[PDB]
Design a protein around this motif. Structure first.
Motif, mmCIF file in Angstrom:
data_model
loop_
_atom_site.group_PDB
_atom_site.id
_atom_site.type_symbol
_atom_site.label_atom_id
_atom_site.label_comp_id
_atom_site.label_asym_id
_atom_site.label_seq_id
_atom_site.Cartn_x
_atom_site.Cartn_y
_atom_site.Cartn_z
ATOM 1 N N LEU D 80 0.831 -1.204 0.000
ATOM 2 C CA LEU D 80 0.000 0.000 0.000
ATOM 3 C C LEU D 80 0.866 1.253 0.000
ATOM 4 O O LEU D 80 0.634 2.181 -0.784
ATOM 5 C CB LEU D 80 -0.948 0.002 1.202
ATOM 6 C CG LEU D 80 -1.862 1.205 1.491
ATOM 7 C CD1 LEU D 80 -1.171 2.281 2.333
ATOM 8 C CD2 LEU D 80 -2.430 1.800 0.208
ATOM 9 N N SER D 84 0.959 3.752 -3.086
ATOM 10 C CA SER D 84 0.664 5.177 -2.964
ATOM 11 C C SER D 84 1.795 6.034 -3.519
ATOM 12 O O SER D 84 1.558 6.940 -4.324
ATOM 13 C CB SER D 84 0.386 5.531 -1.504
ATOM 14 O OG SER D 84 -0.759 4.847 -1.024
ATOM 15 N N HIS D 87 1.734 6.320 -7.025
ATOM 16 C CA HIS D 87 0.652 7.196 -7.461
ATOM 17 C C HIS D 87 1.025 8.665 -7.306
ATOM 18 O O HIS D 87 0.588 9.500 -8.107
ATOM 19 C CB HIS D 87 -0.621 6.849 -6.677
ATOM 20 C CG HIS D 87 -1.738 7.839 -6.821
ATOM 21 N ND1 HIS D 87 -2.968 7.489 -7.335
ATOM 22 C CD2 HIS D 87 -1.840 9.141 -6.460
ATOM 23 C CE1 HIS D 87 -3.764 8.544 -7.328
ATOM 24 N NE2 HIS D 87 -3.103 9.560 -6.802
ATOM 25 N N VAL D 88 1.840 8.999 -6.303
ATOM 26 C CA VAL D 88 2.135 10.399 -6.016
ATOM 27 C C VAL D 88 3.120 10.975 -7.026
ATOM 28 O O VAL D 88 2.899 12.062 -7.571
ATOM 29 C CB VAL D 88 2.655 10.558 -4.576
ATOM 30 C CG1 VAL D 88 2.809 12.029 -4.235
ATOM 31 C CG2 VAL D 88 1.705 9.907 -3.600
ATOM 32 N N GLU D 129 -9.813 3.451 -7.034
ATOM 33 C CA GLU D 129 -9.822 3.601 -5.581
ATOM 34 C C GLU D 129 -10.234 2.320 -4.872
ATOM 35 O O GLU D 129 -10.244 2.290 -3.636
ATOM 36 C CB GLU D 129 -10.739 4.753 -5.143
ATOM 37 C CG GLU D 129 -11.948 5.004 -6.017
ATOM 38 C CD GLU D 129 -12.517 6.406 -5.850
ATOM 39 O OE1 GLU D 129 -11.892 7.227 -5.144
ATOM 40 O OE2 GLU D 129 -13.593 6.685 -6.424
ATOM 41 N N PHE D 132 -6.906 0.236 -3.629
ATOM 42 C CA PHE D 132 -6.619 0.720 -2.285
ATOM 43 C C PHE D 132 -7.634 0.178 -1.285
ATOM 44 O O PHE D 132 -7.268 -0.566 -0.370
ATOM 45 C CB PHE D 132 -6.593 2.249 -2.274
ATOM 46 C CG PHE D 132 -5.484 2.840 -3.094
ATOM 47 C CD1 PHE D 132 -5.614 2.981 -4.467
ATOM 48 C CD2 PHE D 132 -4.301 3.230 -2.494
ATOM 49 C CE1 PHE D 132 -4.590 3.519 -5.218
ATOM 50 C CE2 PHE D 132 -3.274 3.766 -3.239
ATOM 51 C CZ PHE D 132 -3.419 3.910 -4.602
ATOM 52 N N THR D 154 -9.984 4.542 3.251
ATOM 53 C CA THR D 154 -9.772 4.616 1.812
ATOM 54 C C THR D 154 -10.075 6.014 1.288
ATOM 55 O O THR D 154 -9.213 6.654 0.675
ATOM 56 C CB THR D 154 -10.636 3.579 1.100
ATOM 57 O OG1 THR D 154 -10.485 2.308 1.744
ATOM 58 C CG2 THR D 154 -10.251 3.486 -0.368
ATOM 59 N N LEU D 157 -7.627 8.458 2.317
ATOM 60 C CA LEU D 157 -6.227 8.216 1.886
ATOM 61 C C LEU D 157 -5.953 8.761 0.488
ATOM 62 O O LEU D 157 -5.018 9.523 0.368
ATOM 63 C CB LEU D 157 -5.870 6.734 1.929
ATOM 64 C CG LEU D 157 -4.568 6.426 1.201
ATOM 65 C CD1 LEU D 157 -3.411 7.124 1.878
ATOM 66 C CD2 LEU D 157 -4.320 4.938 1.128
ATOM 67 N N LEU D 158 -6.725 8.379 -0.528
ATOM 68 C CA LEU D 158 -6.415 8.884 -1.892
ATOM 69 C C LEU D 158 -6.909 10.317 -2.060
ATOM 70 O O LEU D 158 -6.451 10.976 -2.975
ATOM 71 C CB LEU D 158 -6.915 7.947 -2.995
ATOM 72 C CG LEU D 158 -8.235 7.224 -2.763
ATOM 73 C CD1 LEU D 158 -8.611 6.428 -3.996
ATOM 74 C CD2 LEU D 158 -8.149 6.300 -1.569
ATOM 75 N N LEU D 161 -3.859 11.770 -1.079
ATOM 76 C CA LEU D 161 -2.816 11.567 -2.076
ATOM 77 C C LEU D 161 -3.031 12.455 -3.291
ATOM 78 O O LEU D 161 -2.063 12.835 -3.961
ATOM 79 C CB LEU D 161 -2.754 10.097 -2.496
ATOM 80 C CG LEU D 161 -2.371 9.090 -1.411
ATOM 81 C CD1 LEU D 161 -2.968 7.720 -1.699
ATOM 82 C CD2 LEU D 161 -0.866 9.005 -1.269
ATOM 83 N N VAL D 187 4.167 10.344 1.682
ATOM 84 C CA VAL D 187 3.435 9.177 2.164
ATOM 85 C C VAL D 187 3.940 8.691 3.517
ATOM 86 O O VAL D 187 3.208 7.978 4.218
ATOM 87 C CB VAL D 187 3.470 8.026 1.142
ATOM 88 C CG1 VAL D 187 3.239 8.551 -0.267
ATOM 89 C CG2 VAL D 187 4.781 7.258 1.227
#
Lengths: 194, 200, 199, 198
Positions: D80, D84, D87-88, D129, D132, D154, D157-158, D161, D187
């Motif tokens: 995870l 993430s 993704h960032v 999503e 995640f 969830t 979190l995004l 992010l 993160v």
DNA sequence: AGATACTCCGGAGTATCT
DNA sequence: TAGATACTCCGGAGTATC
């Protein structure tokens, strides 16, 4: 009456951004009050302009007209009243511009021919001068040149102080008069004594 | 650099001069050049951009004539008189380009304006003060080697450039004016401004 | 008195949140409170002026609700979580207002503005930065004196506030909310921003 | 060609983040690419198609680098966290594209193809999503993640992010390794929270 | 190919009005 | 006088072109 203070604010606002960029509730805010007062006294927004022209155009007469009877030469006397003209310019400035804000602008019949009258009361104010430079050249105190252009170029130049002079709002009678005198000494005297 | 942009600037300059910047619409300018509103926006994105384009052309077109005479032969007044005719010569020629470069200062703080437009507007409100400066700077030396009267510089320059531009409140258009037939009259009014009125 | 203006702001703040500044028309705002374009224009000189009025009010409230929690007792952490719950509480009750203070920075140079408008907007944006540096001051107090892990206080501030506001995405409003329900949810959100996940 | 379109979408997406969708004009995008509107319309039937073209691209762009980490070995937190941060950095190098994924659905005239196209495009975002939402659920189940609401954790979190674009502007000349180095610090706070035990 | 204009039209801003 | 009615005109997406 209390009409006087809206014109004192409308004149500068009309000079500030012109007649168009001046909205009417703009002037409703500079004199913090109802905007119905504006219409209860003035039948439309153009009435404000005609009024500021009205209480302005004749206002200039009262200062400079008495200098026509004073004796002396054409120069000795034209400088006498042209000082008073630009003296008046430096005091009631906002009004002074609204007597020329017709240059970039349908209407009503009574409202329109109102303006026609004041336009010739400006004509006859200007033509008061046009005589004195006609006498001025003939007398011999004034540099022998075209007598009908020099009238156009004087009130072109007399009114032109609005272009550069901003305000002082507290400048005494002495300092308005003593800058009114060296501004016409610049125009009547030109520059260059030889 | 103006092929058809030039004739947009030319037509809008007259309109802004005869009915003000407020009351001239884009499809007014469209008719004046024989097309519709879509062409004008193809060459300018806002209306104020038409204005700034006239403002910038109108001043490039006066410092091109006058600035040569800054280093002209002769006295300070002889240069000054040289300068001040060329200023009036193009005033009388492009009275349309002129009525917008001298009557566009209120916008400074009172009109909705993108910054690109706003700071470009005041970019010329200081470009002019340089044109004003190169006059001022010779009314000085018109007196240092004594060609003009000892009156203070600033007001003399401030009054004069005001005088030089005040010809639009009465100047007609003599349709067919030759290049010297505006010179026969431009030189008339500078010497009524430099000579003033009244003998000794 | 000046409570008709509040109705215009309430209506405008919501309409700006959902439709956006561009697609919200004055006649629309005029409809949300049942009047014409005129009443909207009787209380404001321009449309961008109702925008600044929502921004100004929005920053005024969130600073009123959050500030009494930093001069408060507890550690730098316990104060941080106290303000952070209050900030998301303001989010959850008046989000038509928060959404305009949290969006509208582009107007800076590419939208037409009177210089009173451009300047008055620049003022509130530094009302923002001073609000947000209340948080910076405290994370440093929390970090340095025991409370918080020795992390980069600049990035922690930049993150935390952006996480604090990111609640605008997934939050909508149950018809007839209760602030008791929202305080528990706000502390739930805050619990994972300062507590994170893991160990 | 194919490169020419890519720099329409590149300039478009970047404008959409700075001015917003409403305030970018077609001639705006024409300028950042240095061209004319008759090019973009030869290239795109509508301005909204421009928006979905970058929506459609920026979503396969982000998914192409984060799926390898949901199957990647490690417990819930490990992968995870690994998901993430991948993704960032995507948003740190494409945030014109990254922003555009959440700026949309019936408001203005939306020719049926593209409303059908759009809320289908929303579906792959929800499915995104979900990876995640699964691994956090798989993380609270093992013990690498603390015992919190898997639905809320969830969402928060995004949401977090994606909230990086608030402060991260752009650098255009940043190394891949200094981007990856910064994405982890972000993160490390999102996952670790802030506060020790003693 | 795709650069130049056209054209349709929303929507902000205004004066004036009963 | 408040708030309203009617209206001008700029700017933008979209299309038609020799």
């Amino acid at each position: 009456d209390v009409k006087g203070r809206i014109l004192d604010a409308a004149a500068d606002a009309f000079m500030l951004r012109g007649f168009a960029n001046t909205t009417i509730d703009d002037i409703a805010d500079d004199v913090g009050a109802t905007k119905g007062l504006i219409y209860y006294h003035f039948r439309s927004k153009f009435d404000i302009f005609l009024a500021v022209y009205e209480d302005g155009m004749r206002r200039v007469r009262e200062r400079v007209e008495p200098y026509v009877g004073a004796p002396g030469t054409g120069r000795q006397r034209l400088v006498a009243m042209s000082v008073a003209h630009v003296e008046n310019l430096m005091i009631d400035l906002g009004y002074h511009h609204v007597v020329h804000q017709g240059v970039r602008d349908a209407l009503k019949v009574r409202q329109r021919d109102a303006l026609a009258a004041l336009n010739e009361l400006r004509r006859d104010y200007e033509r008061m001068f046009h005589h004195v430079i006609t006498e001025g050249i003939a007398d011999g105190s004034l540099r022998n040149v075209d007598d009908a252009l020099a009238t156009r170029t004087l009130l072109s130049n007399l009114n032109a102080v609005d272009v550069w002079y901003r305000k002082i709002e507290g400048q005494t009678e002495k300092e308005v008069h003593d800058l009114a005198s060296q501004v016409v000494d610049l125009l009547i005297g030109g520059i260059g004594a030889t």
